[PDB]
């Protein structure tokens, strides 16, 4: 660095870290999120009232706090090969809908939760779960038994308990009870309903957070 | 009698540097530390460590020979040094209240607005509280050391630098209490008794750090400033022992040995580092 | 695949370790890592 | 592509405003240069303002008088000159110069525009040569000290400037090809003296070739060689 | 049944082993490589870096958004490339310097000119036809380039037209490592059903298999004179195979070294074999002896990426803590 034009390399290398800075700041201020679930889990629904060839990137505000939701599931490749790269997000958003006695296809999707939710990676993360076409659901359990998916459950073939042991089923695979937790919510029509319910699970997550750095917690 | 003591407050003024130094150098050892709240606190380990340096020796050395021997001029340096770095390691412990008051009940200025300019600004602050609260003696007031006795500097001085940041402390601290008593209480019996039992073990946890921190600050600095409000205005009656009177003032000094036991040592992300670098 | 891979002519494995460790010698001296390149014509010191 | 404004007749000891609209590339990422040419003689250069405009340089005769600065959003240059004499008479260049590792500054000159008001010494050996199309020709330059930095870099360039064209790059780092040169052309040398070798000459190489340093800050040129 | 003659032919072809013919010849010794460049400013981590063949200037790319050009001798930053997917997974250097390419989570494979005459770097085109997120990518010259995905195949681009002119499949997983031979006739690719395969590029057939590995192939790597790789898989070993032979020669592991390799590389003279770990170091093994000469220690969170200068000056070691550091 001591001819005319290697300072002025000097400088440009400046500005560019000048410029890097910005776009980390700038990047740093956006919450990100994990989009997952079967593809007949209705995650295109959430999509469509979340902004109402491989991964799709989502870009929505709600009251002031930029979400950036990473579809990952429309690439069949092997999912332990790329899924560190998401490790950090602030929240994993896992659909579900409970219609799945088709296939059952209810327990592809507990295997992908219990998957999902204990990986090394995700240790910290929390899950805000999405249980879809409740009304669906409610035609098909008075149409079928819940038997035909969980030959265990002896409760009533009702909305209420059907719904509740369901629940109780995707919130008993974390097996880190202590490190994280699970925002369990019944997909309702109104769209404002779910981009509130995902913004109060990243809202007590990131206090949460606050309060396990400063001790209290 | 002179050696023990002189032995006792060496082995203090050496763990306060040892330990400040360590925080100062932890936070520039690893990038995992360098963040807003880290930020402050090592703001924090560097003014107690000077604290450490400029001082405690005199102020030992003041002790042991029981008499000042450097002269007016290095009595009033130490006295603007002494009172300047106190105040400000007190109104740090309040910055880091305020910061952690401010992440914990607003989560979107914590994404959005959060910069390390404002620990700059903090820190700033602070160091103005600082040096607003030790000019005056040394503007508008030889065999002994005193700061002025002037009521109306007393109060204002006293009021500044402990009442005031102990107040806002106590408040800031309240609300962050209430906020995490709200977060926490917000055949499956067997899983509610486990939820019910990790939100006990999260209140005792939330109660015992909120004690430590306060416990700490009232224990070192309140006996100290309580002393130096009541005497000026009670000379005449209030004849305490010159052993208490020491007492005290060296648990008021001891406090910038005690800042990083709480902040950082005590701090996971510090010991990880701590045990990472040796 | 294995149709034609099985028809592949081989050589000995001796015959490879030997020529593998001819190339490391010949080229021994040309390796800037394997040897104390001095600073004077080290571009990085 | 550059295109400049803004000069004319100008009385003595008045002041002008010379701008370049730049069109046709990034110009916030490029540091440009002012290169002037009195009517006759060689190129003399005049400033410089790098990208983000966080260093200038000015010569020693326009310094105080002459103001550069840059409008990145509208990509346009300025030349803020005041107390203008008469030896500020000139056509003015603006000089495209982008500098990273391997990068050709100086490589796209604008068109210039007529003002009218009415160091490391480098000597070009020959004024005049005449050549006819087909032969071999070889330009010599000499420096008063030596071009050869520490890092290996020799800082010579050489410019050709066709009748009635602005100056083109030819040669970068005394070695260096600009891009669409063509390969007739063909730079060596070593320290203190430099030699332009043309091959197979052809009817366009007719001009005057100027050489120019660029290991210190005032930017000598050539009195300049020419070829007829 | 072929799978039996392949290994009765490999057995009948094994008579002595790579250690003891390398007995014969002395040990290399410590080799203290000592960090000379630390190379900072991405704010993420490190997924891959390259090497321009003028052996100074290194491309990295980081999941910030970023792919970085370096001046490596002085640290200095020549271009600074925004990417439309900040997933990219994989990046690379044409031997001309022309032009570098990157691609990702996002199928496609974009391609950058840095010599554009409007002094920004431009995509030149995005290559898309993959099926599966992209593993690797290098260039054969400035027009082909030969990418491997996810999708389990690996492709040739015709980059002018934009199209594959071949398609290499054969693979059961994805492919995670692609190495071009020196003269760029033939290629090798590692994939995560425990194999390499050796690929024509002008037959667009494969020739060989090696198995071997135990876990997903990492990384894989030509020894110089282009007769033999070394291959890095989850199971903690690297290990290297004869083109000629069709065999394993000698394999590189070590009692604590219980991590998978995500990188490898050779020194220009092929004595020295350097990997990269998820124990977030780099070890340089002996290749004739499989000895471990040094360890590179100087990263924090993951080595993910190390290459070897064309002049064999000094290696390069990206890692997810962001730093590349520079060994020599
Ligand atoms: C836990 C630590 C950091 C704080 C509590 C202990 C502190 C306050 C103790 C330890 C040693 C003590 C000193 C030891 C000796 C003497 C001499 C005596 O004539 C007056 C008190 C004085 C000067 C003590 C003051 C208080 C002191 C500094
Ligand atoms: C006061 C002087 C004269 C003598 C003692 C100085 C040093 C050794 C003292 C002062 C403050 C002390 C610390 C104060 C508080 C705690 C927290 C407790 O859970 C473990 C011990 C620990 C970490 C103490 C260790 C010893 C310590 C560092
Ligand atoms: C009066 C006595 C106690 C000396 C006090 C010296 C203090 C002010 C010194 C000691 C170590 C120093 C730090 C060492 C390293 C760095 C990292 C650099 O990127 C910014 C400055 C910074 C953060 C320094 C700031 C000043 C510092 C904190
Ligand atoms: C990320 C970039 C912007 C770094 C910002 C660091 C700022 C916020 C902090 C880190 C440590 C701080 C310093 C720590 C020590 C002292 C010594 C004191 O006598 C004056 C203030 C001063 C000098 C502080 C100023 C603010 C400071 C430099
Ligand atoms: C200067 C030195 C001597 C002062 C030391 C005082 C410290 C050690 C004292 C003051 C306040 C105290 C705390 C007050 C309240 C609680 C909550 C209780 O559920 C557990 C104990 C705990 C957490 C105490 C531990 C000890 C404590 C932190
Ligand atoms: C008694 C006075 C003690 C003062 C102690 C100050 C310790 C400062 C240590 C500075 C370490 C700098 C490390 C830089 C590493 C990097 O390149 O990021
Ligand atoms: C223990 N020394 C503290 C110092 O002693 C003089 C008065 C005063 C006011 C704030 S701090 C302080």
Redesign the pocket.
């Known amino acids: 660095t001591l001819s005319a034009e290697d300072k002025a390399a000097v400088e440009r290398s400046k500005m560019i870290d000048r410029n890097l800075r910005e776009d980390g700041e700038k990047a740093a201020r956006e919450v990100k999120l994990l989009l997952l679930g079967a593809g007949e889990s209705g995650k295109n629904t959430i999509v469509k009232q979340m902004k109402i060839t491989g991964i799709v990137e989502t870009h929505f505000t709600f009251k002031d706090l930029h979400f950036k939701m990473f579809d990952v599931g429309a690439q069949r490749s092997e999912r332990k090969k790329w899924i560190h790269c998401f490790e950090g997000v602030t929240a994993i958003i896992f659909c579900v809908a409970l219609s799945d006695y088709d296939l059952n296809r209810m327990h592809a999707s507990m295997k992908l939760f219990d998957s999902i939710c204990n990986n090394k990676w995700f240790t910290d993360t929390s899950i805000i779960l999405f249980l879809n076409k409740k009304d669906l659901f409610e035609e098909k359990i008075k149409k079928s038994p819940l038997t035909i998916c969980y030959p265990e459950y002896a409760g009533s073939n009702t909305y209420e308990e059907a719904a509740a042991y369901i629940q109780c089923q995707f919130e008993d695979l974390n097996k880190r009870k202590d490190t994280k937790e699970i925002y369990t919510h019944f997909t309702c029509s109104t769209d404002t309903k779910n981009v509130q319910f995902v913004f109060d699970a990243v809202t007590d997550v990131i206090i949460k957070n606050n309060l396990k750095d400063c001790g209290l917690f | 009698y002179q050696v023990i003591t002189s032995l006792l407050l060496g082995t203090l003024i050496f763990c306060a540097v040892l330990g400040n130094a360590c925080v100062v150098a932890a936070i520039a050892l690893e990038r995992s530390l360098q963040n807003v709240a880290n930020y402050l606190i090592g703001s924090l380990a560097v003014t107690d460590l000077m604290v450490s340096v400029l001082?405690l020796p005199m102020?030992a050395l003041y002790q042991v020979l029981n008499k000042w021997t450097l002269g007016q001029v290095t009595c009033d340096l130490f006295?603007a040094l002494?009172?300047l770095?106190?105040?400000s390691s007190?109104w740090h412990l309040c910055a880091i209240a305020l910061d952690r008051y401010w992440a914990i009940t607003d989560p979107i200025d914590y994404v959005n607005k959060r910069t390390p300019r404002r620990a700059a600004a903090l820190i700033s602050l602070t160091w103005l509280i600082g040096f607003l609260?030790?000019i005056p003696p040394m503007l508008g007031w030889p065999d002994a050391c005193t700061?002025s006795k002037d009521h109306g500097y007393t109060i204002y001085?006293?009021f500044?630098?402990?009442y005031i940041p102990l107040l806002l402390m106590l408040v800031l601290y309240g609300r962050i209490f209430r906020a995490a008593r709200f977060r926490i209480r917000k055949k499956n019996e067997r899983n509610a008794e486990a939820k019910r039992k990790m939100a006990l073990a999260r209140e005792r946890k939330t109660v015992k750090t909120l004690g430590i921190i306060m416990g700490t600050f009232i224990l070192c600095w309140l006996p100290?400033?309580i002393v130096?409000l009541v005497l000026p205005f009670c000379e005449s009656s209030c004849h305490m022992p010159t052993l208490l009177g020491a007492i005290i003032?060296?648990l008021?000094?001891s406090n910038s040995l005690l800042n990083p036991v709480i902040y950082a040592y005590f701090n996971k992300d510090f010991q990880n580092a701590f045990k990472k670098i040796i | 695949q294995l149709k034609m891979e099985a028809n592949i002519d081989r050589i000995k494995v001796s015959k490879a370790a030997a020529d593998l460790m001819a190339y490391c010698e010949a080229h021994a001296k040309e390796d800037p890592l394997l040897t104390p390149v001095p600073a004077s014509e080290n571009p990085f010191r | 592509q550059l295109v400049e404004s803004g000069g004319g007749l100008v009385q003595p000891g008045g002041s002008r405003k010379l701008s370049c609209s730049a069109s046709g590339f990034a110009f916030s990422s490029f540091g440009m240069h002012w290169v002037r040419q009195a009517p006759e003689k060689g190129l003399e250069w005049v400033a410089y303002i790098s990208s983000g405009s966080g260093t200038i340089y000015y010569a020693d005769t326009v310094k105080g008088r002459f103001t550069i600065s840059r409008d990145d959003p509208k990509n346009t240059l300025f030349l803020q000159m005041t107390s203008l004499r008469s030896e500020d008479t000139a056509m003015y260049y603006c000089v495209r110069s982008i500098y990273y590792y391997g990068s050709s500054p100086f490589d796209f000159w604008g068109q210039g525009t007529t003002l009218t008001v009415s160091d490391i010494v480098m000597t070009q050996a020959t004024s005049s040569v005449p050549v006819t199309p087909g032969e071999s020709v070889s330009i010599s330059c000499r420096s008063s000290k030596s071009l050869l930095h520490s890092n290996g870099n020799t800082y010579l360039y050489w410019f050709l400037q066709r009748p009635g064209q602005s100056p083109q790059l030819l040669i970068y780092r005394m070695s260096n090809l600009a891009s669409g040169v063509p390969d007739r052309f063909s730079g060596s040398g070593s320290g203190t003296a430099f030699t332009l070798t043309i091959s197979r000459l052809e009817a366009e190489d007719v001009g005057v070739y100027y050489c120019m340093q660029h290991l210190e800050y005032p930017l000598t040129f050539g009195a300049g060689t020419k070829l007829e | 049944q072929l799978k039996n003659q392949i290994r009765d032919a490999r057995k009948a072809c094994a008579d002595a082993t790579l250690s003891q013919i390398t007995n014969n010849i002395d040990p290399v010794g410590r080799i203290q490589m000592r960090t000379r460049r630390t190379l900072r400013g991405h704010l993420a981590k490190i997924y891959a870096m390259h090497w321009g063949t003028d052996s100074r200037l290194l491309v990295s790319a980081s999941q910030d958004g970023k792919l970085i050009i370096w001046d490596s001798y002085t640290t200095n930053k020549v271009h600074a490339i925004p990417l439309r997917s900040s997933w990219v997974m994989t990046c690379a250097y044409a031997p001309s310097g022309n032009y570098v390419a990157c691609g990702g989570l996002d199928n496609i494979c974009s391609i950058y000119n840095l010599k554009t005459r409007e002094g920004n770097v431009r995509v030149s085109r995005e290559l898309a036809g993959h099926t599966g997120y992209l593993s690797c990518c290098r260039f054969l010259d400035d027009n082909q380039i030969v990418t491997s995905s996810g999708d389990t195949t690996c492709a040739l681009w015709d980059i002018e037209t934009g199209q594959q002119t071949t398609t290499f499949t054969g693979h059961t997983g994805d492919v995670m490592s692609l190495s071009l031979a020196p003269d760029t006739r033939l290629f090798v690719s590692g994939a995560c059903d425990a194999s390499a395969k050796l690929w024509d590029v002008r037959e667009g057939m494969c020739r060989q298999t090696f198995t071997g590995h135990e876990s997903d192939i990492n990384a894989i790597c030509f020894f110089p004179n282009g007769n033999a790789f070394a291959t890095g898989s989850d199971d903690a070993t690297c290990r290297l195979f004869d083109l000629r032979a069709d065999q394993e020669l000698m394999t590189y592991s070590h009692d604590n070294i219980i991590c998978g390799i995500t990188s490898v590389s050779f020194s220009k003279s092929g004595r020295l074999l350097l990997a990269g770990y998820d124990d977030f170091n780099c070890n340089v093994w002996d290749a004739l002896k499989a000895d471990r000469a040094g360890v590179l220690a100087g990263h924090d969170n993951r080595v993910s990426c190390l290459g070897v200068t064309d002049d064999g000056m000094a290696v390069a070691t990206g890692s997810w803590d962001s730093f590349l550091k520079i060994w020599n």
């Open positions: 001082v102020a006295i002494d009172v770095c106190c105040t007190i609260i030790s700061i001085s006293t500044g630098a402990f100290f400033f130096a003032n060296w008021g000094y």
